[PDB]
Design an enzyme around this catalytic site. Structure first.
Site, PDB file in Angstrom:
ATOM      1  N   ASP A 137       2.759  -8.557   6.608  1.00 38.13           N
ATOM      2  CA  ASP A 137       1.640  -7.780   6.084  1.00 38.13           C
ATOM      3  C   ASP A 137       0.382  -8.499   5.601  1.00 38.13           C
ATOM      4  O   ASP A 137      -0.438  -7.916   4.890  1.00 38.13           O
ATOM      5  CB  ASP A 137       2.152  -6.832   4.997  1.00 38.13           C
ATOM      6  CG  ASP A 137       1.213  -5.682   4.738  1.00 38.13           C
ATOM      7  OD1 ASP A 137       0.824  -5.001   5.710  1.00 38.13           O
ATOM      8  OD2 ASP A 137       0.857  -5.468   3.562  1.00 38.13           O
ATOM      9  N   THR A 138       0.198  -9.748   5.991  1.00 35.13           N
ATOM     10  CA  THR A 138      -1.001 -10.462   5.572  1.00 35.13           C
ATOM     11  C   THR A 138      -1.989 -10.709   6.716  1.00 35.13           C
ATOM     12  O   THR A 138      -3.023 -10.059   6.782  1.00 35.13           O
ATOM     13  CB  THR A 138      -0.656 -11.785   4.892  1.00 35.13           C
ATOM     14  OG1 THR A 138       0.243 -12.523   5.726  1.00 35.13           O
ATOM     15  CG2 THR A 138      -0.011 -11.539   3.525  1.00 35.13           C
ATOM     16  N   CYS A 146      -0.764 -20.071  -1.854  1.00 34.27           N
ATOM     17  CA  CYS A 146      -0.086 -19.695  -0.624  1.00 34.27           C
ATOM     18  C   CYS A 146       0.404 -20.835   0.238  1.00 34.27           C
ATOM     19  O   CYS A 146      -0.375 -21.677   0.702  1.00 34.27           O
ATOM     20  CB  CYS A 146      -0.989 -18.802   0.222  1.00 34.27           C
ATOM     21  SG  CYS A 146      -0.105 -17.896   1.593  1.00 34.27           S
ATOM     22  N   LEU A 147       1.708 -20.836   0.466  1.00 37.85           N
ATOM     23  CA  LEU A 147       2.347 -21.841   1.296  1.00 37.85           C
ATOM     24  C   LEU A 147       2.116 -21.520   2.763  1.00 37.85           C
ATOM     25  O   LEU A 147       2.058 -22.416   3.593  1.00 37.85           O
ATOM     26  CB  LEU A 147       3.855 -21.883   1.015  1.00 37.85           C
ATOM     27  CG  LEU A 147       4.335 -22.483  -0.311  1.00 37.85           C
ATOM     28  CD1 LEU A 147       5.789 -22.125  -0.546  1.00 37.85           C
ATOM     29  CD2 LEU A 147       4.141 -23.984  -0.301  1.00 37.85           C
ATOM     30  N   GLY A 148       1.994 -20.235   3.081  1.00 32.27           N
ATOM     31  CA  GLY A 148       1.781 -19.855   4.466  1.00 32.27           C
ATOM     32  C   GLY A 148       0.336 -19.897   4.927  1.00 32.27           C
ATOM     33  O   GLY A 148       0.019 -19.413   6.007  1.00 32.27           O
ATOM     34  N   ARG A 190       0.856  -1.175   0.000  1.00 29.26           N
ATOM     35  CA  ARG A 190       0.000   0.000   0.000  1.00 29.26           C
ATOM     36  C   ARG A 190       0.896   1.230   0.000  1.00 29.26           C
ATOM     37  O   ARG A 190       0.985   1.952   0.995  1.00 29.26           O
ATOM     38  CB  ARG A 190      -0.916   0.007   1.227  1.00 29.26           C
ATOM     39  CG  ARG A 190      -1.932  -1.131   1.287  1.00 29.26           C
ATOM     40  CD  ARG A 190      -2.634  -1.171   2.646  1.00 29.26           C
ATOM     41  NE  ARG A 190      -1.669  -1.299   3.743  1.00 29.26           N
ATOM     42  CZ  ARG A 190      -1.092  -2.437   4.117  1.00 29.26           C
ATOM     43  NH1 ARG A 190      -1.382  -3.576   3.501  1.00 29.26           N
ATOM     44  NH2 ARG A 190      -0.174  -2.423   5.073  1.00 29.26           N
TER      45      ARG A 190
HETATM   46  C1  HEM Z   1      -3.902 -13.594   5.618  1.00 29.19           C
HETATM   47  C2  HEM Z   1      -3.337 -14.637   4.960  1.00 29.19           C
HETATM   48  C3  HEM Z   1      -2.658 -14.604   3.735  1.00 29.19           C
HETATM   49  C4  HEM Z   1      -3.187 -14.370   2.535  1.00 29.19           C
HETATM   50  C5  HEM Z   1      -4.595 -13.868   2.227  1.00 29.19           C
HETATM   51  C6  HEM Z   1      -2.193 -14.740   1.553  1.00 29.19           C
HETATM   52  C7  HEM Z   1      -2.387 -14.677   0.200  1.00 29.19           C
HETATM   53  C8  HEM Z   1      -1.485 -15.102  -0.758  1.00 29.19           C
HETATM   54  C9  HEM Z   1      -1.777 -15.107  -2.157  1.00 29.19           C
HETATM   55  C10 HEM Z   1      -3.056 -14.630  -2.834  1.00 29.19           C
HETATM   56  C11 HEM Z   1      -0.723 -15.667  -2.761  1.00 29.19           C
HETATM   57  C12 HEM Z   1      -0.602 -15.926  -4.261  1.00 29.19           C
HETATM   58  C13 HEM Z   1       0.142 -14.817  -5.001  1.00 29.19           C
HETATM   59  C14 HEM Z   1       0.132 -14.991  -6.513  1.00 29.19           C
HETATM   60  O1  HEM Z   1      -0.460 -15.963  -7.029  1.00 29.19           O
HETATM   61  O2  HEM Z   1       0.707 -14.128  -7.191  1.00 29.19           O
HETATM   62  C15 HEM Z   1       0.224 -16.008  -1.734  1.00 29.19           C
HETATM   63  C16 HEM Z   1       1.451 -16.597  -1.943  1.00 29.19           C
HETATM   64  C17 HEM Z   1       2.393 -16.875  -0.966  1.00 29.19           C
HETATM   65  N1  HEM Z   1       2.213 -16.625   0.369  1.00 29.19           N
HETATM   66 FE1  HEM Z   1       0.593 -15.942   1.231  1.00 29.19          FE
HETATM   67  N2  HEM Z   1      -1.037 -15.202   2.137  1.00 29.19           N
HETATM   68  C18 HEM Z   1      -1.291 -15.080   3.474  1.00 29.19           C
HETATM   69  C19 HEM Z   1      -0.337 -15.322   4.448  1.00 29.19           C
HETATM   70  C20 HEM Z   1       0.982 -15.721   4.229  1.00 29.19           C
HETATM   71  C21 HEM Z   1       1.938 -15.986   5.293  1.00 29.19           C
HETATM   72  C22 HEM Z   1       1.698 -15.994   6.797  1.00 29.19           C
HETATM   73  C23 HEM Z   1       3.086 -16.324   4.689  1.00 29.19           C
HETATM   74  C24 HEM Z   1       4.231 -16.791   5.346  1.00 29.19           C
HETATM   75  C25 HEM Z   1       5.333 -16.025   5.546  1.00 29.19           C
HETATM   76  C26 HEM Z   1       2.831 -16.275   3.237  1.00 29.19           C
HETATM   77  C27 HEM Z   1       3.718 -16.732   2.277  1.00 29.19           C
HETATM   78  C28 HEM Z   1       3.419 -16.944   0.952  1.00 29.19           C
HETATM   79  C29 HEM Z   1       4.351 -17.474  -0.018  1.00 29.19           C
HETATM   80  C30 HEM Z   1       5.708 -18.125   0.239  1.00 29.19           C
HETATM   81  C31 HEM Z   1       3.727 -17.397  -1.212  1.00 29.19           C
HETATM   82  C32 HEM Z   1       4.333 -17.767  -2.551  1.00 29.19           C
HETATM   83  C33 HEM Z   1       4.004 -19.150  -3.070  1.00 29.19           C
HETATM   84  C34 HEM Z   1       4.596 -19.411  -4.448  1.00 29.19           C
HETATM   85  O3  HEM Z   1       4.990 -18.444  -5.140  1.00 29.19           O
HETATM   86  O4  HEM Z   1       4.675 -20.585  -4.843  1.00 29.19           O
HETATM   87  N3  HEM Z   1       1.532 -15.953   2.983  1.00 29.19           N
HETATM   88  N4  HEM Z   1      -0.258 -15.660  -0.505  1.00 29.19           N
HETATM   89  C1  LIG Z   2       0.633 -11.114  -2.860  1.00 29.61           C
HETATM   90  C2  LIG Z   2       1.188 -11.528  -1.492  1.00 29.61           C
HETATM   91  C3  LIG Z   2       0.153 -11.417  -0.354  1.00 29.61           C
HETATM   92  C4  LIG Z   2       1.809 -12.927  -1.556  1.00 29.61           C
HETATM   93  C5  LIG Z   2       2.894 -12.754  -2.639  1.00 29.61           C
HETATM   94  C6  LIG Z   2       3.323 -11.377  -2.245  1.00 29.61           C
HETATM   95  O1  LIG Z   2       4.216 -10.755  -2.814  1.00 29.61           O
HETATM   96  C7  LIG Z   2       2.488 -10.792  -1.124  1.00 29.61           C
HETATM   97  C8  LIG Z   2       2.402  -9.264  -1.199  1.00 29.61           C
HETATM   98  C9  LIG Z   2       2.911 -11.500   0.179  1.00 29.61           C
HETATM   99  C10 LIG Z   2       2.591 -12.972  -0.207  1.00 29.61           C
HETATM  100  O2  LIG Z   2       1.765 -13.572   0.796  1.00 29.61           O
END
Ligand code: HEM
Ligand SMILES: CC1(C)[C@H]2CC(=O)[C@]1(C)C[C@H]2O
Length: 405
Positions: free
Chosen positions: A242-243, A348-350, A177
């Site tokens: 930031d999520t 999302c892995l997290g 943001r």
């Molecule tokens: C409130 C919960 C969260 C939401 C809504 C969220 C949402 C997302 C979304 C939509 C993506 C897909 C991005 C794309 O397709 O371009 C993503 C990817 C990812 N998120 Fe989250 N996320 C959350 C929490 C987290 C947390 C806690 C972590 C851990 C540090 C995290 C780590 C990742 C990673 C590693 C990816 C990349 C996966 C890949 O590229 O294969 N996320 N997340």
């Molecule tokens: C789009 C995302 C929420 C997803 C991939 C990103 O770059 C974020 C900004 C953090 C991660 O969880």
């Protein structure tokens, strides 16, 4: 403001939506974005804001585009272009089959087994934070709970000192943001200047922290490089800081305004997991995109190579064709359909860490502080961007109605 319409864009497909400042933001961010799903708006539109780009408005098109990595590449996932171009986080900026190796390593550090291991600390921190707030009868949920709870758990996982939170959090926020105080590239470089030294140290002397694991990980048979490590950890930071932070606030804001939903979760705890999915659907908050690898006709629209397309993960579950009465929160829906955690190879892995943190909050808060509401005369303001958030959440409650544990 508005960029000149490109030659290939039919003017009847134009709808100037600004993802960083939608018009009806006062009514709520999800509501603001939902205007893209009104009968007067085509399924695929072109906005002249933020440099010009496409936006898919229906869950169907969003899922499709996210599955078709051949035409829709992750290389430039952020809008505006300058941000999408400076974006080099791994595995996100990579398309399959390259992404696969890196995704597996990142999985080692935030996957299911790590969450099961951290469960007790998550629980502990939640109970402690809530109990410390309980007797006060008031708090600014965003800074008193939503921020410290998720962030401290991540700082614990990554092996980074709590003292760095203010600095790191600022840089992260500029990426999702943007304030205007700094460009994505500058925000990215500052975060990198921070990580580089730490990674060097952990390559030399490995610990058990997530960073040490990534910095010494193996990808495709050979060792990961410092640059690859730097770029993966950069992503982990943004995700951990930031999520969940923003999501907790939307949910808590809703709960403070709906006694009927609080009671429901208090009398029937077996519903909490179902409630969690529904809250994730209704208060979905992420919106990023893809870049066209070549000219392609998508659902009758001709997309040209280089065109960026916003595929709001936030919109899939708010789509009426997907969920009846989308804006209504119902913990008993037969099917909660959403793409809150994404779709396609970049799922999302997290997500496991996120859900655990959410469910723990709901249960532990409702146990000690069953009755609460938004402070009198407080205007809750939301903010839009790659990841949406809540500015502040002033809450008030009668301590005499709380229960200590
Ligand atoms: C409130 C919960 C969260 C939401 C809504 C969220 C949402 C997302 C979304 C939509 C993506 C897909 C991005 C794309 O397709 O371009 C993503 C990817 C990812 N998120 Fe989250 N996320 C959350 C929490 C987290 C947390 C806690 C972590 C851990 C540090 C995290 C780590 C990742 C990673 C590693 C990816 C990349 C996966 C890949 O590229 O294969 N996320 N997340
Ligand atoms: C789009 C995302 C929420 C997803 C991939 C990103 O770059 C974020 C900004 C953090 C991660 O969880």
């Amino acid at each position: 403001n508005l960029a000149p319409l490109p030659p290939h864009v039919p003017e009847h497909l134009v709808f100037d939506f600004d993802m960083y400042n939608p018009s009806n933001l006062s009514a709520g961010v999800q509501e603001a974005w939902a205007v893209l799903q009104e009968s007067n708006v085509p399924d695929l539109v072109w906005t002249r804001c933020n440099g010009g780009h496409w936006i898919a408005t229906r869950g169907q098109l969003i899922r499709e585009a996210y599955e078709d990595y051949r035409h829709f590449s992750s290389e430039c996932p952020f809008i505006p272009r300058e941000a999408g171009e400076a974006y080099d986080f791994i595995p996100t900026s990579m398309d399959p089959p390259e992404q696969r190796q890196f995704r597996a390593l990142a999985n080692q550090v935030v996957g299911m087994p790590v969450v099961d291991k951290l469960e007790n600390r998550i629980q502990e921190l939640a109970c402690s934070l809530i109990e410390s707030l309980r007797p006060q009868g008031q708090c600014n949920f965003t800074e008193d709970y939503a921020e410290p709870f998720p962030i401290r758990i991540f700082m614990l996982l990554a092996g980074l000192p709590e003292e760095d939170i203010p600095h790191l959090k600022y840089l992260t926020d500029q990426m999702t943001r943007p304030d205007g105080s700094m460009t994505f590239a500058e925000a990215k470089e500052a975060l990198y200047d921070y990580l580089i030294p730490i990674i060097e140290q952990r390559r030399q002397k490995p610990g058990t922290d997530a960073i040490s694991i990534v910095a010494n990980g193996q990808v495709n048979g050979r060792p990961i490089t410092s640059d690859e490590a730097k770029r993966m950890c950069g992503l982990l930071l943004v995700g951990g800081l930031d999520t969940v932070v923003n999501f907790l606030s939307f949910s808590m804001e809703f709960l403070a305004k709906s006694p009927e939903h609080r009671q429901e979760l208090i009398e029937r705890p077996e519903r909490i997991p179902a409630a969690c999915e529904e809250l994730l659907r209704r208060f979905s908050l992420v919106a990023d995109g893809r870049i066209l690898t070549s000219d392609y006709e998508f659902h009758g629209v001709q997309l040209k190579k280089g065109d960026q397309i916003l595929l709001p993960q936030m919109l899939s579950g708010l789509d009426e064709r997907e969920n009846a009465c989308p804006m209504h929160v119902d913990f008993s829906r037969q099917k909660v359909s959403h793409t809150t955690f994404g779709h396609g190879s970049h799922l999302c892995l997290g997500q496991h860490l996120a859900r655990r943190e959410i469910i723990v909050t709901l249960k532990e808060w409702l146990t000690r502080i069953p009755d609460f509401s938004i402070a009198p005369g407080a205007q809750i303001q939301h903010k839009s961007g790659i990841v949406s958030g809540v500015q502040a959440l002033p809450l008030v409650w009668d301590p005499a109605t709380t229960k200590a544990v």
